Design a protein around this ligand. Structure first.
Ligand SMILES: NC(=O)c1ccc[n+]([C@@H]2O[C@H](COP(=O)([O-])OP(=O)(O)OC[C@H]3O[C@@H](n4cnc5c(N)ncnc54)[C@H](O)[C@@H]3O)[C@@H](O)[C@H]2O)c1
Ligand SMILES: NC(=O)c1ccc[n+]([C@@H]2O[C@H](COP(=O)([O-])OP(=O)(O)OC[C@H]3O[C@@H](n4cnc5c(N)ncnc54)[C@H](O)[C@@H]3O)[C@@H](O)[C@H]2O)c1
Ligand SMILES: Oc1cc(Cl)ccc1Oc1ccc(Cl)cc1Cl
Ligand SMILES: Oc1cc(Cl)ccc1Oc1ccc(Cl)cc1Cl
Lengths: 257, 257
């Protein structure tokens, strides 16, 4: 595959529905060697199972909330991969109470803090910790959402954390470009996953993008995987600091009845 | 003036070079009752003098890093202005060690948290505490910078705080819109203010700017003040959730010399 000889670290796999899973699966198919990380003991087991199915045995614990967790994880990976070619950042969170009802009433100082910490800072924190481990031609990828560009109901504070994420992509790309590292983000459309259920009225938010999206269907984790495999391959050598929308054109249309 | 009959609260006035100062002169010029706030006692004096010249003896203290300080401030203000027509958010901050050098190396979890808290969250925090005191037709204004749109050297983490800030403007305007409140932002070009010296290489970041800018000069707190006065008056009742560029058209040009 166009990803042979590459060693990429994939994070955020929680179930077969996880987007990171569609990404791992697609990269595996293109010949890359994968590495996985799990947040806690609750997920360890299923991640080891998935890693096995994808011919990998490197499964490390990592909570982007603590710099120590990140340093230990990368120091453990370095034992098998003195150097690798980038990682997929598919992590996000915000207390549930934040994603329900009026934005101004729901948002709090703490919720805001948590959302920005786990969903935007963790991306650079990881890059900082493995910077000297990355080979030239490496790519770093994160996953954003339209909420970053437009104001979407109930998405609330996450929207702000994502705008911050996308800005991160541009500052990271510009900072690491000379060393030969590329940084991009995929702005995926609504997908039926596990964390997608935390957003109030989601079953409807999908049926909307359904009949309004140019391609007349929502994207699948497969659609996203293919785009991430590419954005992480040497085929996208000229793309950096970009946020490409993989939503089937939903964002470039307006008032489709 | 076009602001007669409007009561506006202005924050961020530190010297005569402050943008917030330029904004207050214009509004008062357009016939507007003003109220000023100061971060700490070190500035209490200056603010009182400026407030006197602008026909105002309402000078409250307020540290956006504290929910309680924001609560008391509007509690005090409520004694004179049981209801007012909005405020101008001219507040931003980040530890100096975040604003110099390679972004990936400079950024820290602490620096990130603070920058987003003071420069972005405070804006919505203020709206929470005075939401019931606003009249229909009120206007909220904040200040941003092109760093939220592009990767600009040394601006580093402040660029991510601003993107969050600009997204905050869209989420706030969408939530408060049905209440007759408009929320907008002005993306200002480089101005010689008291906090501008805090950015690594600014005098040269200003010398370059006034050379490649369509209007061939850097904006002044006057140009900003005037646009601010307009964005807060009923004259701009058709604008909400917008980020207007008051930078002489610099952001639209490319490759000049
Ligand atoms: N689902 C969508 O429609 C959609 C659309 C656009 C973007 N995204 C983004 O895709 C990414 C993944 O979301 P998802 O849809 O696959 O949901 P998901 O529930 O399948 O996975 C989310 C992951 O976040 C991980 N995580 C949470 N906190 C963590 C922490 N502190 N440390 C390490 N890992 C942590 C979880 O463990 C989990 O694996 C997110 O960035 C998300 O916002 C999703
Ligand atoms: N200077 C520029 O060229 C420029 C360009 C675009 C946007 N802006 C923005 O304009 C705004 C004002 O900056 P400025 O250039 O007038 O510098 P300034 O030094 O004149 O004012 C900055 C203000 O921030 C206030 N502040 C900081 N921490 C605070 C806190 N915890 N609580 C309450 N107030 C606090 C300061 O006290 C001060 O008044 C900022 O949002 C800034 O980023 C400035
Ligand atoms: O960003 C998202 C956008 C969509 Cl349309 C659906 C799910 C998304 O992802 C999340 C939303 C809230 C929390 Cl707390 C965690 C995650 Cl992973
Ligand atoms: O945003 C700004 C943009 C420019 Cl060009 C000049 C000054 C700016 O304002 C700040 C920069 C850094 C810190 Cl710590 C605080 C403030 Cl108020």
């Amino acid at each position: 595959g166009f990803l042979s000889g590459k060693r990429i670290l994939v994070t955020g796999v929680a179930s077969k529905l996880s987007i990171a899973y569609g990404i791992a699966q697609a990269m595996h198919r293109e010949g890359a060697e994968l590495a996985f990380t799990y947040q806690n003991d609750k997920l360890k087991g299923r991640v080891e199972e998935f890693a096995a199915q994808l011919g990998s045995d490197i499964v490390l614990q990592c909570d982007v909330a603590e710099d120590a967790s990140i340093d230990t994880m990368f120091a453990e990976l370095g034992k098998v991969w003195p150097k690798f070619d980038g990682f997929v950042h598919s992590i996000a969170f915000a207390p549930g109470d934040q994603l329900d009802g009026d934005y101004v009433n729901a948002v709090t100082r703490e919720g805001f803090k948590i959302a920005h910490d786990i969903s935007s800072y963790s991306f650079v924190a990881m890059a900082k910790a493995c910077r000297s481990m990355l080979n030239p031609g490496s790519a770093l990828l994160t996953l954003s959402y339209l909420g970053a560009e437009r104001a979407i109901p109930n998405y609330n504070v996450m929207g702000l954390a994502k705008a911050s994420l996308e800005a991160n992509v541009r500052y990271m790309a510009n900072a690491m470009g000379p060393e030969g590292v590329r940084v991009n983000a995929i702005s995926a459309g609504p997908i039926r996953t596990l964390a997608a259920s935390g957003i109030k009225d989601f079953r409807k938010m999908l049926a909307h993008c359904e009949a309004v999206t140019p391609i007349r269907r929502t994207v699948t984790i497969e659609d996203v995987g293919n785009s991430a495999a590419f954005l992480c391959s040497d085929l996208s050598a000229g793309i950096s600091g970009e946020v490409v929308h993989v939503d089937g054109g939903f964002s470039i249309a307006a008032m489709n009845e």
